[PDB]
Write a protein that binds this ligand. Structure first.
Ligand SMILES: [C][C]S(=O)(=O)N1[N][C]C2=[C][C]=C(OC3=C(/[C]=N/[O])[C]=C(C(F)(F)F)[C]=[C]3)[C]=C2[B]1([O])[O]
Length: 264
């Protein structure tokens, strides 16, 4: 018997096999969840990444900036899940920020056009997705998004930090809307993870300062932190997807090795 036995969950944000969403999807399927996966612009290549998952899963096209995609998403999911069946979970693992708003680039030199695009994708889309999917969610359901603790400023992450701050605020309002359906809405604030996205930033002064953040994180974390292992994060997301945190919503769960509770 698995944690998510007989639950229908939509997982978005799977770009590579190193994406956090892939490990969330992997662990979810290991725990008995029936999945619906979304992607964009490389569905042939994405499906082949998806094929490495334990179980087969339908793949739907979703650009969270496309209003037509969002307006038809709910229906397209139903034609895949089956009529009379609803979703029990939605995982939002989508974030983006142009180079000008991250890395070694001066914080002031990021034009708003780039920042607005990042915030649309990283923060506003969380509400867009909730708006589209809540009608086809069962009571007791769970919406989960991804987060990186933005309560304090930091190097390199720059404007992505701001987009995460907005996301945290958006989540609290999504929770108000989700409550009417009996649905919870939460974020998982993870410690630093070596996704291909972040791995690129490290290589592409800033990269050294990222290493300083990574090193300091593991030391600070009372139980340690492995940036190469996304599994503890994925299990945390699955925990929120289950029925074992049923009184938690509009909230943030920190899967960071306990680093945010330690100063030094
Ligand atoms: C899920 C996709 S996402 O786009 O929306 N996203 N959300 C959560 C999230 C959580 C942790 C992350 O890892 C880091 C690292 C990693 N170092 O190895 C370094 C820094 C810093 F501050 F040093 F630059 C920040 C986050 C990345 C992401 B994220 O921005 O990819």
């Amino acid at each position: 018997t698995g944690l998510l036995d007989g639950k229908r969950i939509l997982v978005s944000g799977i770009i590579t096999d190193s994406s956090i969403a892939f490990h969330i999807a992997r662990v979810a399927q290991e725990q008995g969840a029936q999945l619906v996966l979304t992607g964009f612009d490389r569905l042939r290549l994405i499906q082949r990444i998806t094929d490495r998952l334990p179980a087969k899963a339908p793949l739907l096209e979703l650009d969270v900036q496309n209003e037509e995609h969002l307006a038809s998403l709910a229906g397209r999911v139903t034609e895949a899940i089956g009529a009379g069946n609803k979703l029990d979970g939605v995982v939002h693992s989508i974030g983006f920020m142009p180079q000008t708003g991250m890395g070694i680039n001066p914080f002031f030199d990021a034009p708003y056009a780039d920042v607005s695009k990042g915030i649309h994708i990283s923060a506003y889309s969380y509400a867009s997705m909730a708006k589209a999917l809540l009608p086809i969610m069962n009571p007791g359901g769970s919406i989960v998004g991804m987060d990186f603790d933005p309560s304090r400023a930091m190097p390199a992450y720059n404007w992505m930090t701001v987009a995460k701050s907005a996301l945290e605020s958006v989540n609290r309002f999504v929770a108000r809307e989700a409550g009417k359906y009996g649905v919870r809405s939460n974020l998982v604030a993870a410690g630093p993870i070596r996704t291909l996205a972040m791995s690129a930033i490290v290589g592409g002064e800033a990269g050294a300062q990222i290493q300083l953040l990574e090193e300091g994180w593991d030391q600070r974390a009372p139980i340690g932190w492995n940036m190469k292992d996304a599994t503890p994060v994925a299990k945390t997301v699955c925990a929120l997807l289950s029925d074992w945190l049923p009184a938690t919503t509009g909230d943030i769960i920190y899967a960071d090795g306990g680093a945010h509770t330690q100063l030094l």
